């Protein structure tokens, strides 16, 4: 029935918390450490002066 | 690495040997004047590695590589 | 329920855009092997390459010497020096090196390796010492 909550969407229970939730990106992180091929230990070598 | 063994050899078993053969294969400590490769990452110049002579503290306190603030225009 | 290690479904999206007739012979498919070359070496009057070790072959060649006296080490030097990479730099600048360069100057289609062979002991050493 439409009363019922057995067969609810368990994925609607995650209210959105952002606008476009549902458009898909294709472009790459532009913050994402993708290319560089650097240790994860080493990460203080990329912080700021 | 004994060459007539075909194999590599323990210092604390070779207390018999009293020299070396020629042909042997030894592993030493790494000393002052040999040379190593600096790298720092992210390596982006052709600097980013380089060839350094090694000076060895012997400070046991010390477990920093040590460096000219001269040299660290090499990798940045 | 809840499973965390996702594996993050991975895509591609630029598609590439690379610009009788019998079954098959023992020819056209197979010989995998490739045809061996013949050696034809440039005339010594005929080269073009420079006389001048470059620092790649230079440093190739005191390297292969040292590794050779290291297993080896009957030597040419006249002074005794402790380590190979010593000897070898010392057999080059004496111009000694029993070693010799070939430039692969062309692999042609009809199964000739046109080289250009370079002997260490007339050419210029650029290294320091």
């Given at each position: 029935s439409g009363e019922d909550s057995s067969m609810d969407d368990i994925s609607a229970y995650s209210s959105p918390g952002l606008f476009g939730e549902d458009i898909i990106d294709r472009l790459d992180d532009?913050?994402?450490?993708?290319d560089v091929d650097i240790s994860l230990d080493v990460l203080d070598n990329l912080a700021p002066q | 690495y004994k060459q007539i063994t075909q194999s590599v050899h323990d210092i604390e078993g070779?207390?018999?040997?009293?020299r070396l053969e020629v042909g042997d294969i030894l592993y030493r400590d790494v000393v002052t004047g040999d040379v190593a490769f600096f790298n720092r990452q992210?390596?982006?110049?052709?600097?980013s590695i380089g060839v350094h002579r090694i000076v060895v503290?012997?400070?046991?306190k010390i477990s920093t590589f040590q460096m000219n603030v001269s040299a660290c225009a090499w990798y940045n | 329920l809840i499973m965390d290690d996702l594996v993050e479904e991975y895509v591609e999206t630029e598609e590439e855009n690379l610009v009788e007739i019998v079954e098959s012979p023992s020819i056209c498919?197979?010989?995998?092997?490739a045809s061996s070359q013949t050696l034809v070496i440039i005339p010594d009057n005929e080269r073009i390459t420079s006389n001048v070790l470059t620092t790649f072959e230079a440093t190739r060649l005191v390297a292969v010497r040292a590794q050779q006296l290291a297993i080896n080490?009957?030597?040419?030097?006249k002074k005794k020096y402790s380590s190979p990479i010593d000897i070898a730099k010392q057999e080059l600048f004496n111009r000694k090196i029993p070693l010799l360069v070939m430039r692969c100057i062309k692999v042609t289609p009809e199964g000739q390796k046109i080289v250009e062979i370079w002997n260490p002991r007339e050419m210029g050493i650029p290294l320091l010492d």
């Open positions: 532009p913050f994402s450490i993708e | 070779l207390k018999q040997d009293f992210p390596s982006l110049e052709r600097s503290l012997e400070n046991p | 498919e197979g010989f995998v092997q080490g009957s030597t040419m030097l």
